[PDB]
# Entry
Amino acid sequence: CRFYQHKFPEVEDVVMVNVRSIAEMGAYVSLLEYNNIEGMILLSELSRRRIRSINKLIRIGRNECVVVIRVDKEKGYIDLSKRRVSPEEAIKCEDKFTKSKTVYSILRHVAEVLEYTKDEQLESLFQRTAWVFDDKYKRPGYGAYDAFKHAVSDPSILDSLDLNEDEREVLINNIN
Amino acid sequence: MDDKELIEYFKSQMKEDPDMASAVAAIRTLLEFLKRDKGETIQGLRANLTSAIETLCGVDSSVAVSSGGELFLRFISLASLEYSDYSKCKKIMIERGELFLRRISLSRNKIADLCHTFIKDGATILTHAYSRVVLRVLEAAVAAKKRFSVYVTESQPDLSGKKMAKALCHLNVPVTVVLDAAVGYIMEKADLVIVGAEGVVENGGIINKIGTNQMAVCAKAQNKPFYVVAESFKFVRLFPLNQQDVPDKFKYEEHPWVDYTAPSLITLLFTDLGVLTPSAVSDELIKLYL
Amino acid sequence: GSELSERIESFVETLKRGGGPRSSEEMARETLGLLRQIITDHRWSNAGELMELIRREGRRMTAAQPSETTVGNMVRRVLKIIREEYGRLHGYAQLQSNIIEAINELLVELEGTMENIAAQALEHIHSNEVIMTIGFSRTVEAFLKEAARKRKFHVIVAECAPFCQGHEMAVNLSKAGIETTVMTDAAIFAVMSRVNKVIIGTKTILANGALRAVTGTHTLALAAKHHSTPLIVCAPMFKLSPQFPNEEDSFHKFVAPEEVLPFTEGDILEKVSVHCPVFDYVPPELITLFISNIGGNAPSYIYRLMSELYHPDDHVL
Amino acid sequence: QVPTRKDYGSKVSLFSHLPQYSRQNSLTQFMSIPSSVIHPAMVRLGLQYSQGLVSGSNARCIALLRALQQVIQDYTTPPNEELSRDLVNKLKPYMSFLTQCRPLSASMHNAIKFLNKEITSVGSSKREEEAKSELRAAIDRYVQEKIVLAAQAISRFAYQKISNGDVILVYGCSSLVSRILQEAWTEGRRFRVVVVDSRPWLEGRHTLRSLVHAGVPASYLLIPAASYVLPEVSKVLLGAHALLANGSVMSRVGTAQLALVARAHNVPVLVCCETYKFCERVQTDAFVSNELDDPDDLQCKRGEHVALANWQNHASLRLLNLVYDVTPPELVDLVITELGMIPCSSVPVVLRV
# Structure
């Protein structure tokens, strides 16, 4: 499931991507937060060192923080830039990424607990709960993490999002 | 330009100039496509260009077309794009494409001016089949007041070496149309063999019309210098070991259109990057692709 | 000023008349000293004006002797040094002292050339080995006479028929005690069955790995290719030229045919055609290894040294 | 300090500059049981080098780098002294001991060069354990990127070369070619492999098992029979131990023989070597720099007579078993590195820069 109420990231947003392949024009990467949607990133000529030390297997897999440079939701393309990500922006993106991964693990365990035989059921329940909490706290992403933490010591805050009993119990247990 | 026009365009570009190569017209079609695409995505253009190059690989069966497609895709995506809304990106890309096209267009003349210094007076040039590069270099050789006889094979699947002899006989140079199976017969009187190639593989070998390998080997047994005159866009990322190891889409009861010559069979290359030994073809090719 | 043109004209007619001085590294040192004197005795605002100046005197100095390439390629290396310093200062007034110290760096690099080749010589000579050389070259005799300090081997110095200069190399190697064997030039293929490797010098390395050298060494390379014995071209990198072989046929240096057929031969000198080429062309496929001051290199690597030492815009000079 | 290993047998008059040792005696017979001069990991590694337990060039380089990790982890800093000089001066006698046990392959020389350059580039303001962890991470990155990731890259570049229905000839034991063949069989290519082995190591039997356990149809034979099978061979893959400056390929002794016989049968040769095995040393024959193994290893038991049992009693008899030879680069077509498929004559151009 995606991280945010949107199915694609917005323009001028910082994301975390896994580099999937390197090609002539640029590098193709998978955006993990947009259901592994495909993006691409350009390579500055100075960053062109395929001749001397390529070892393409190096970047064949890696986590990176990148800035959304251009999006086209209809065509489905997201172009990203590493050079435009500031170090402070990279640190914030890394923190966000860890938070989103934690929310992901919580929601995947919740979806498993309720035996959601269909992906759309689990995605809908997790996305709706995370977005609703995000709205309550006006903070996409961070809201869910903080809410799980509150569920560790005070599980009743999760009682009203009654998807099922098992989902709530498993969320509190793993948070706790 | 929903691909149909592209195929049509390419054709209009190849028939408008009969002295024009095919890969140049392919790069002009790619530049036209980028010029009028109407897509705002620094990545949205790479998939469209790849589909275009596979339509220009399907229409044209030459090796140089796919090579020029890869070189145009690399040379348009070189500078620090850093675009706000693709407007800067597309404009810079178009500028780069035009620069690349101009470099290609002055390449052939560079080839001729750099190569014609090897033809001695009274030399006998051996030539396989029609190519505008060796014809240009022979016109540069006759421009410097040099006298030489040319034996041009006929290259039987399409008698184009005969067409080369017609276009070179109009140049007022002594040319003789030799049967294709006589390259072992006339090698003893032809002191050097100048052959234009249509594709240069990584090791330094060449991809050419079917009679080049037997011609090059006949030149190696008689110690004759085998010179190859090709441009920079005819480089390819292939490494064939045998005549079967070339891809079948460049080859075509068993009538291939393309053979392969080993780099050990080649004396020199005359590219726009310079007069190269085949190990310089490998170094320069990797550097050029970048 | 005027003394500059005095030295230039003396150098030009020195190259036109004969060999002054005798060996080529002295010629490279004189050429670099003359070029540093040229760049310190003129006035310029842009580097391109000095580039045309250096191109003009290079055209004159290589038209003095087209067969000897050391002055021309030394001028060309100074041109690439000027281009590199202008490129590193462009991306103005401190250009002249930088070119002076870069040429000084080139002189210190160049003075320790034969001894650097001699230092790496022990990696190519083992004990009781049969070596065949041709001609006379100070690089090869320093190579062998210092490799004989720890090894004992055999050298067959073949003389060259126009000027039997292998005799001087023979009497110089016998002073070091290397079991020097002197033969003619007609017995090379007669003794190639026992020669383990061929270590020769050259006059000019071309851009494709080919080389012009003392005449009769193309035959020596063919005989060593027939017997598959490796060729060691002990050559420094001021004999590296971007000039391709087929270029206006001004390759061989023809001298008076007196050394081949004397003037006292008779009336048959009128109805005879005597040629004496003192140089010969060896293709790169007949060469195994070059030994330069930076190490051992393949003939498939000279273009790279070419791109590291010369600029393609100065190949015409 | 450290003595010299004793020369065994009667050396070849052509190989008088190269040392010839024996696997029967060890250098550690007259050394301390508590390892004090040399680090204990270094004496363990040198003993398992001299006895032949680690013979592959990548396995030797890995064991070298792991023993260097054990040295750097078990290192202390003397007072008022810097790490960047003393650690080099302490690792140099270690490499001298490793040379006296067995001469190092060029993988080990380039690994030592990388470690020396890395230990020179340790900052002076950094503490002890932080620089120790930095060096351990640098050694880990070196092994991981140089061999494992370069091996995956070479495997991918060789998968697009091996076709279906062809026959492939291999020689000796090398993890790179065996990994190429295994990942080509697993990724979908159906081919058969012949295997040329040679005395006295007979190390091709190892790769034979590796291909039979992987499900590859195999054929096993020796070097002299290669002239019989090269009419069936369509491709010969080889495992290089070093690539030289002129483009020569230093490998096991039958490599150049197989390349010559393969060119006599018009069989294209393919070498597969990682770029850390690139040597600035250059050679033109197999005589000026080579390793000489035990001359008493060449003997075998064909019945009840060993002709070379008492070979040292014959004064005019010399035994030599070379380990490495070189191939001229006009015999090798491919050089498949992690940088790509390059020809053999273009290898020093692309490797240098």
Remarks:
- Strands of chain C lie at 130-134, 154-158, 180-183, 197-200, 204-205, 211-214, 231-234, 279-282, 289-292, 295-297.
- The interface with chain D takes residues 123-124, 126-128, 197, 230, 232, 288-289, 295-298, 300-301, 304 of chain C (CB under 8 Å).
- Chain C has eleven helices and ten strands.
- The two ends of chain C are 23 Å apart (CA to CA).
